[PDB]
Design a protein around this motif. Structure first.
Motif, PDB file in Angstrom:
ATOM      1  N   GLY A  98       0.731  -1.222   0.040  1.00  0.00           N
ATOM      2  CA  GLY A  98      -0.058   0.011  -0.032  1.00  0.00           C
ATOM      3  C   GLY A  98       0.961   1.378  -0.109  1.00  0.00           C
ATOM      4  O   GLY A  98       0.245   2.335   0.328  1.00  0.00           O
ATOM      5  N   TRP A  99       2.059   1.249  -0.478  1.00  0.00           N
ATOM      6  CA  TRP A  99       3.007   2.582  -0.286  1.00  0.00           C
ATOM      7  C   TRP A  99       2.552   3.496  -1.348  1.00  0.00           C
ATOM      8  O   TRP A  99       2.108   3.198  -2.559  1.00  0.00           O
ATOM      9  CB  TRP A  99       4.368   2.071  -0.425  1.00  0.00           C
ATOM     10  N   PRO A 100       2.112   4.694  -1.013  1.00  0.00           N
ATOM     11  CA  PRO A 100       1.483   5.549  -1.845  1.00  0.00           C
ATOM     12  C   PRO A 100       2.626   6.612  -2.416  1.00  0.00           C
ATOM     13  O   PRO A 100       2.033   7.400  -3.269  1.00  0.00           O
ATOM     14  CB  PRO A 100       0.565   6.504  -0.986  1.00  0.00           C
ATOM     15  N   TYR A 101       3.980   6.423  -2.395  1.00  0.00           N
ATOM     16  CA  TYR A 101       4.912   7.374  -2.846  1.00  0.00           C
ATOM     17  C   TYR A 101       5.843   6.627  -3.811  1.00  0.00           C
ATOM     18  O   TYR A 101       5.975   5.530  -3.822  1.00  0.00           O
ATOM     19  CB  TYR A 101       5.509   7.877  -1.643  1.00  0.00           C
ATOM     20  N   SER A 102       6.556   7.681  -4.550  1.00  0.00           N
ATOM     21  CA  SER A 102       7.503   7.190  -5.517  1.00  0.00           C
ATOM     22  C   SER A 102       8.954   6.970  -5.046  1.00  0.00           C
ATOM     23  O   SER A 102       9.706   6.556  -5.537  1.00  0.00           O
ATOM     24  CB  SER A 102       7.641   8.311  -6.777  1.00  0.00           C
ATOM     25  N   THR A 103       9.045   7.354  -3.448  1.00  0.00           N
ATOM     26  CA  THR A 103      10.241   7.336  -2.971  1.00  0.00           C
ATOM     27  C   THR A 103       9.933   6.698  -1.445  1.00  0.00           C
ATOM     28  O   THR A 103       8.863   6.725  -1.029  1.00  0.00           O
ATOM     29  CB  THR A 103      10.917   8.394  -2.832  1.00  0.00           C
ATOM     30  N   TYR A 104      11.061   6.301  -0.833  1.00  0.00           N
ATOM     31  CA  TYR A 104      10.900   5.681   0.588  1.00  0.00           C
ATOM     32  C   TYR A 104      12.419   5.824   1.114  1.00  0.00           C
ATOM     33  O   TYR A 104      13.538   5.804   0.637  1.00  0.00           O
ATOM     34  CB  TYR A 104      10.223   4.721   0.835  1.00  0.00           C
ATOM     35  N   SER A 105      12.480   5.963   2.465  1.00  0.00           N
ATOM     36  CA  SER A 105      13.292   5.334   3.247  1.00  0.00           C
ATOM     37  C   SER A 105      12.633   4.395   4.252  1.00  0.00           C
ATOM     38  O   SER A 105      11.701   4.632   4.821  1.00  0.00           O
ATOM     39  CB  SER A 105      14.472   6.281   3.787  1.00  0.00           C
ATOM     40  N   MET A 106      13.356   3.229   4.609  1.00  0.00           N
ATOM     41  CA  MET A 106      13.167   2.314   5.540  1.00  0.00           C
ATOM     42  C   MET A 106      14.319   2.192   6.385  1.00  0.00           C
ATOM     43  O   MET A 106      15.451   1.908   6.150  1.00  0.00           O
ATOM     44  CB  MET A 106      12.374   1.253   5.084  1.00  0.00           C
ATOM     45  N   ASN A 107      13.859   2.126   7.823  1.00  0.00           N
ATOM     46  CA  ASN A 107      14.665   1.674   8.777  1.00  0.00           C
ATOM     47  C   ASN A 107      14.238   0.331   9.499  1.00  0.00           C
ATOM     48  O   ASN A 107      13.134   0.208   9.727  1.00  0.00           O
ATOM     49  CB  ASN A 107      14.726   3.138  10.057  1.00  0.00           C
ATOM     50  N   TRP A 108      15.349  -0.204  10.337  1.00  0.00           N
ATOM     51  CA  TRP A 108      15.069  -1.022  11.425  1.00  0.00           C
ATOM     52  C   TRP A 108      15.508  -0.258  12.747  1.00  0.00           C
ATOM     53  O   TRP A 108      16.554   0.120  12.753  1.00  0.00           O
ATOM     54  CB  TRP A 108      15.841  -2.251  11.455  1.00  0.00           C
ATOM     55  N   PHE A 109      14.534  -0.218  13.701  1.00  0.00           N
ATOM     56  CA  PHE A 109      14.638   0.304  14.946  1.00  0.00           C
ATOM     57  C   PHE A 109      14.646  -0.720  15.986  1.00  0.00           C
ATOM     58  O   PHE A 109      14.191  -1.994  15.719  1.00  0.00           O
ATOM     59  CB  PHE A 109      13.835   1.290  15.498  1.00  0.00           C
ATOM     60  N   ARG A 110      15.358  -0.543  17.177  1.00  0.00           N
ATOM     61  CA  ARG A 110      15.174  -1.446  17.953  1.00  0.00           C
ATOM     62  C   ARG A 110      14.894  -1.150  19.656  1.00  0.00           C
ATOM     63  O   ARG A 110      15.222   0.092  19.816  1.00  0.00           O
ATOM     64  CB  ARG A 110      16.244  -2.703  18.265  1.00  0.00           C
ATOM     65  N   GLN A 111      14.095  -1.681  20.482  1.00  0.00           N
ATOM     66  CA  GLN A 111      13.964  -1.272  21.748  1.00  0.00           C
ATOM     67  C   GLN A 111      14.115  -2.274  22.826  1.00  0.00           C
ATOM     68  O   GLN A 111      13.548  -3.301  22.851  1.00  0.00           O
ATOM     69  CB  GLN A 111      12.429  -0.816  21.935  1.00  0.00           C
ATOM     70  N   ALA A 112      15.230  -2.074  23.354  1.00  0.00           N
ATOM     71  CA  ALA A 112      15.782  -3.008  24.282  1.00  0.00           C
ATOM     72  C   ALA A 112      14.949  -2.831  25.806  1.00  0.00           C
ATOM     73  O   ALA A 112      14.638  -1.762  26.006  1.00  0.00           O
ATOM     74  CB  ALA A 112      17.439  -2.775  24.513  1.00  0.00           C
ATOM     75  N   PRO A 113      14.919  -3.941  26.474  1.00  0.00           N
ATOM     76  CA  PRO A 113      14.506  -3.770  27.881  1.00  0.00           C
ATOM     77  C   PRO A 113      14.850  -2.717  28.816  1.00  0.00           C
ATOM     78  O   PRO A 113      16.187  -2.534  28.735  1.00  0.00           O
ATOM     79  CB  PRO A 113      14.785  -5.205  28.548  1.00  0.00           C
ATOM     80  N   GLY A 114      13.951  -1.960  29.006  1.00  0.00           N
ATOM     81  CA  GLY A 114      14.229  -0.651  29.902  1.00  0.00           C
ATOM     82  C   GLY A 114      14.958   0.521  29.174  1.00  0.00           C
ATOM     83  O   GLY A 114      15.331   1.526  29.793  1.00  0.00           O
ATOM     84  N   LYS A 115      15.127   0.372  27.851  1.00  0.00           N
ATOM     85  CA  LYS A 115      15.748   1.355  26.912  1.00  0.00           C
ATOM     86  C   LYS A 115      14.958   2.096  26.110  1.00  0.00           C
ATOM     87  O   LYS A 115      13.917   1.666  25.571  1.00  0.00           O
ATOM     88  CB  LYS A 115      16.923   0.843  26.395  1.00  0.00           C
ATOM     89  N   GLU A 116      15.532   3.261  25.544  1.00  0.00           N
ATOM     90  CA  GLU A 116      14.815   4.024  24.541  1.00  0.00           C
ATOM     91  C   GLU A 116      14.977   3.136  23.331  1.00  0.00           C
ATOM     92  O   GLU A 116      16.030   2.704  22.839  1.00  0.00           O
ATOM     93  CB  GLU A 116      15.437   5.416  24.410  1.00  0.00           C
ATOM     94  N   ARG A 117      14.007   3.515  22.184  1.00  0.00           N
ATOM     95  CA  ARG A 117      13.932   3.223  20.824  1.00  0.00           C
ATOM     96  C   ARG A 117      15.309   3.622  20.378  1.00  0.00           C
ATOM     97  O   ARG A 117      15.470   4.939  20.272  1.00  0.00           O
ATOM     98  CB  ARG A 117      12.938   3.192  20.285  1.00  0.00           C
ATOM     99  N   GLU A 118      16.020   2.984  19.557  1.00  0.00           N
ATOM    100  CA  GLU A 118      17.091   3.248  18.766  1.00  0.00           C
ATOM    101  C   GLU A 118      17.277   2.807  17.425  1.00  0.00           C
ATOM    102  O   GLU A 118      16.897   1.633  17.165  1.00  0.00           O
ATOM    103  CB  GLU A 118      18.460   2.862  19.493  1.00  0.00           C
ATOM    104  N   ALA A 119      17.711   3.621  16.564  1.00  0.00           N
ATOM    105  CA  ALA A 119      18.156   3.172  15.028  1.00  0.00           C
ATOM    106  C   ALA A 119      19.099   2.041  15.083  1.00  0.00           C
ATOM    107  O   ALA A 119      20.191   2.273  15.598  1.00  0.00           O
ATOM    108  CB  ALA A 119      18.239   4.311  14.324  1.00  0.00           C
ATOM    109  N   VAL A 120      18.822   1.268  14.082  1.00  0.00           N
ATOM    110  CA  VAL A 120      19.869   0.016  13.804  1.00  0.00           C
ATOM    111  C   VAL A 120      20.345   0.201  12.483  1.00  0.00           C
ATOM    112  O   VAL A 120      21.434   0.316  12.614  1.00  0.00           O
ATOM    113  CB  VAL A 120      19.071  -1.373  14.032  1.00  0.00           C
ATOM    114  N   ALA A 121      19.538   0.522  11.698  1.00  0.00           N
ATOM    115  CA  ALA A 121      19.944   0.430  10.141  1.00  0.00           C
ATOM    116  C   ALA A 121      18.932   1.270   9.362  1.00  0.00           C
ATOM    117  O   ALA A 121      17.748   1.133   9.537  1.00  0.00           O
ATOM    118  CB  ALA A 121      19.989  -1.020   9.585  1.00  0.00           C
ATOM    119  N   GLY A 122      19.297   1.937   8.050  1.00  0.00           N
ATOM    120  CA  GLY A 122      18.339   2.482   7.073  1.00  0.00           C
ATOM    121  C   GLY A 122      18.879   2.236   5.682  1.00  0.00           C
ATOM    122  O   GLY A 122      20.064   1.985   5.415  1.00  0.00           O
ATOM    123  N   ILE A 123      18.153   2.505   5.117  1.00  0.00           N
ATOM    124  CA  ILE A 123      18.082   2.231   3.630  1.00  0.00           C
ATOM    125  C   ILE A 123      17.292   2.927   2.828  1.00  0.00           C
ATOM    126  O   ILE A 123      15.913   3.275   3.244  1.00  0.00           O
ATOM    127  CB  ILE A 123      17.848   0.520   3.216  1.00  0.00           C
TER     128      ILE A 123
END
Length: 127
Positions: free
Chosen positions: A26-51
């Motif tokens: 259902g992606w409506p755009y001609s462009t994107y970036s996509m990330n993996w984030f992670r949230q470890a126990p008791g921690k803030e969500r952090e970026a892992v990788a992007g493309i």
């Protein structure tokens, strides 16, 4: 409607490997970036990788060469996180996220579309 469907999580032994998938539909755009984030126990969500739709994958998180690779299959509209040499501290809920802007961003508030999250639990080695 945009959907980001994750798969591939679960339990891993210390030192093991895992590959996560995130299928975009259902992606409506001609462009994107996509990330993996992670949230470890008791921690803030952090970026892992992007493309992005024009930029090859990069790893935000410090580790080694090494532990993480992000890739995509354009025909399948899917992005992947290959993980290797996993350690207990890689235990987290892993999220896929998407946005129109095709530059690379580590900021969670830049992403308006999120997968539901999948748990990755890395067990410890004897000692």
């Amino acid at each position: 409607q945009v959907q980001l469907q994750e798969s591939g999580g679960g339990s891993v032994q210390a030192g093991g490997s895992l590959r996560l998938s995130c299928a975009r539909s259902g992606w409506p755009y001609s462009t994107y970036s996509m990330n993996w984030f992670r949230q470890a126990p008791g921690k803030e969500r952090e970026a892992v990788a992007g493309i992005s739709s024009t930029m090859s994958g990069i790893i935000f998180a410090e580790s080694k060469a090494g532990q993480f690779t992000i890739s995509q299959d354009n025909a399948k509209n899917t992005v992947y996180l290959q993980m290797n040499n996993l350690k207990p501290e890689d235990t987290a809920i892993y999220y896929c996220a998407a946005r129109r802007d095709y530059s690379l961003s580590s900021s969670s508030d830049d992403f308006d579309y999120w997968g539901q999250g999948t748990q990755v639990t890395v067990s410890s080695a004897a000692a």
